[PDB]
């Protein structure tokens, strides 16, 4: 009756249904080939504020059952094309970053931890998850990198991968079709550039309005409809309208 690690695949989501239909069969087959037990949670942001990838991931982490002993923060549009990218339980060193800057098609800087990042449950809890202050594109992953170093942890990446930035992942994301929300308002630039010791997993404010059970060509996926709250006295750049 051997125990096996189980991965909660946490997919930040808003208006990406076409991407989702490609994601689910691709990831299900890819993970089955390497024997990784897992479940996909689509973290569907249904408030009207700007997209907040990091807070959705905090909510996903809270919701997912304790049976999942590690999470994969996973963009819905970024699909691994190399079976040697192992989505395995991370070591004691810290998070396992699958979409490394030598492998990612777009981002190539040393401490990039975006795209696909696998974290043990206990490490994520020790770090108080991710900051809640990042509304709109950018920076939430870089702040989480500092959280990793501040916890005395390190990032590990796949070794001896022979593919490179052109052929390790498919990133089907056209910048005019899916526009990156890079607006700034109020003092967003100056506030989001600073390390956030005040927010995270323990104080993300939200309601899950509905949980949907979906099957896509027989593959079960959970949809969380997440209503994020924004405190405009703290982060008014949740809405630049
Ligand atoms: O309006 C949005 C913005 C982003 N995302 C999710 O957030 C991920 C990261 O965003 P993006 O693709 O814009 O980042 P980049 O391609 O710059 O890494 C996407 O793949 C989606 O999973 C989404 O679902 N809706
Ligand atoms: Mn993308």
UniProtKB/Swiss-Prot annotation:
Its cofactor is Mn(2+). The keyword NAD does not apply. Keywords: Disulfide bond, Glycoprotein, Glycosyltransferase, Golgi apparatus, Manganese, Membrane, Metal-binding, Nucleotide-binding, Signal-anchor, Transferase, Transmembrane, Transmembrane helix. Disulfide bonds join 185-240, 230-238. Disruption phenotype: RNAi-mediated knockdown is lethal. RNAi-mediated knockdown in imaginal disks causes a reduction in the wing size and a distal truncation of the legs. Also, synthesis of heparan sulfate and chondroitin sulfate is reduced in the posterior region of late third instar wing imaginal disk. Glycans are attached at residue 166. One of its GO terms (cellular component) is Golgi apparatus. Mn(2+) binds at residues 77, 171, 173. Transfers galactose from UDP-D-Galactose (UDP-Gal) to the acceptor xylose residue in the linkage tetrasaccharide region of the glycosaminoglycan side chain of proteoglycans. No activity towards beta-GlcNAc, beta-Glc, beta-Gal, and beta-GalNAc as acceptors. This is Beta-1,4-galactosyltransferase 7. It comes from Drosophila melanogaster (Fruit fly). The gene is beta4GalT7. The chain holds residues 71 to 311 of 322 of the full protein.
């Amino acid at each position: 009756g051997a125990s096996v690690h189980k991965m909660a695949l946490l997919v930040p989501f808003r208006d990406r249904f076409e991407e989702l239909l490609q994601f689910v069969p691709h990831m299900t087959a890819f993970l089955k080939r390497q024997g990784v037990a897992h479940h996909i949670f689509v973290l569907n942001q249904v408030d009207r504020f700007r997209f907040n990838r990091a807070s959705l991931i905090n909510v996903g982490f809270q919701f997912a059952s304790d049976v999942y002993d590690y999470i994969a923060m996973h963009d819905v549009d970024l699909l691994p094309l190399n079976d040697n990218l192992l989505y395995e339980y991370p070591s004691s060193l810290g998070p396992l970053h699958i979409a490394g800057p030598k492998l990612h098609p777009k981002y190539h800087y040393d401490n990039f931890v975006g795209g696909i990042l696998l974290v043990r449950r206990e490490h994520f809890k020790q770090m108080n998850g991710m900051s809640n202050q990042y509304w709109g594109w950018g920076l939430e992953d870089d702040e989480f990198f500092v959280r990793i170093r501040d916890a005395g942890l390190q990032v590990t990446r796949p070794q001896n991968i022979k593919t490179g930035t052109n052929d390790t992942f498919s990133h089907i994301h056209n910048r005019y079709h899916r526009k990156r929300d890079t607006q700034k308002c109020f003092n967003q630039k100056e506030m989001t550039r600073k390390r956030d010791h005040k927010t995270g997993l323990d104080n993300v404010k939200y309601k899950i309005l509905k949980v949907h059970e979906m099957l896509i060509d027989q593959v079960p996926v959970t949809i969380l409809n997440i209503l994020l709250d924004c405190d405009v006295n703290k982060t008014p750049w949740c809405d630049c309208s």
